[PDB]
Homo-oligomer: 182 residues x 3
């Protein structure tokens, strides 16, 4: 069967940069028959409300154990809401099932780290998609971190593409990878 | 269950600008377990056959009611072919089902307008993907309009990226969003 | 039902240019209810290990018969591993099925060839996504070739975007098209 893991809608400030909560992350991992679709969006708060062209690139890493459970140690972690989305409602069901492994990046296919770098428009409606208002966001798959069995990294890059200070309100971002076997 | 709503193959000139039919829009919304995939392509006609660096940006809005039924008042609307694609054939079934809501952009997740701006190659096979032969297409999700409960807007932008006149024959465009609950 | 055709993990050097194996191609075609997702990645070998700004553009074409069986005559072809992925493991099953047609690009929808040109990051983790380390990969759908019923072409373009020599280790690339009817 399919399975979706997600933050739920209306996330708290659940993305930490060096132990400070600064980004609201909506993250959805939907496993259909074989592939997992990552659907995500991010909103900066406080000192990340607006990002400058000189902003250092940074990763938001999700660490998962061998059962596909989110660990407490990443930048997006089990201290904030995360769990299964039941078909038919918008709840987060936090009690893990064996099925959660199906949302993880297949260890054999991604036995070394893989990546997808894509455009990440910022404040796109308000700036009417101006070319110099996009950065990049690179998904890194299974780059090692601590004792995590699986990792998903959202790495925001190339802020120097920006013509000036820009609201850190990302587009909806999509990535795809091969799901793990049960 | 999954459900697809689409224009069918070989659409008529069904994209209206200033109440004039000027673009042939192929649009498919496929809901699988949780996410909806937008798969779309566009061909300009008449004064929109060729676009150039002097072309002004424009939007094609689809308006849907609370049941996921396409309304008559958008730029792409219920006055042209639109409905469900049966698994196993290429017909368009016009009679609404409860299931059509499942193709809609989830109103909790998209409680304010969301966007994805992406490259939109033009005439890409013919021009062999020359870098200066792309524009952008931004999908806007749930921009408020009229009495619509849901909206999808295809906004064509950044014609100034083009090196010159180019056939408005878009790549196959893909976007993804979280589906509404039954 | 859904169905996935793929090369399996850790593919051999299975991309041929002038009858010489030069690229390792991971290719996955996953059909869900209606759409097919192409998930692919490439690693150059030998003379293709490093690519330069002056690299000759080239295509890797897959040719399929009317039943969705991969033919022997494309650049990626039936002389190497290819077949169905069972749900639950990473094997490659050679036994054809009626379902394999469902991975093919819908002949009526793509009676004229379609394309999607997208960014193709190279060596992206190592170069931390530097903008000048991307090329383009265009998927061409049903560009006619010989006696094939369906074709998928991966055309690698715009090497002249590169700032210098770069390891031909692509990002995970994703494309989407409407699947064929049984």
């Amino acid at each position: 069967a399919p399975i979706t893991l997600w933050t739920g809608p209306g996330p708290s400030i659940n993305g930490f940069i060096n132990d400070t909560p600064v980004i609201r992350c909506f993250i959805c991992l939907t496993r259909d028959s074989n592939l997992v679709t990552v659907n995500a969006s991010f909103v900066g708060e406080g000192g990340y409300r607006i990002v400058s062209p000189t902003q250092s690139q940074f990763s938001l890493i999700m660490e998962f154990d061998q059962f596909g459970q989110l660990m407490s140690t990443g930048n997006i972690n089990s201290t904030t809401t995360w769990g299964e989305k039941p078909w038919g409602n918008n709840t987060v069901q936090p009690r893990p099932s064996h099925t959660w492994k199906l949302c993880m990046p297949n260890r054999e296919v991604y036995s070394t780290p893989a990546a997808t770098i894509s455009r990440c428009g910022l404040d796109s409606i308000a700036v009417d998609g101006a070319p110099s208002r996009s950065i990049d966001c690179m998904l890194i798959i299974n780059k090692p971190k601590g004792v995590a069995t699986y990792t998903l990294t959202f790495r925001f890059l190339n802020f120097n593409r920006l013509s000036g200070g820009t609201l850190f309100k990302t587009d909806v971002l999509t990535f795809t990878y091969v799901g793990e076997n049960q």
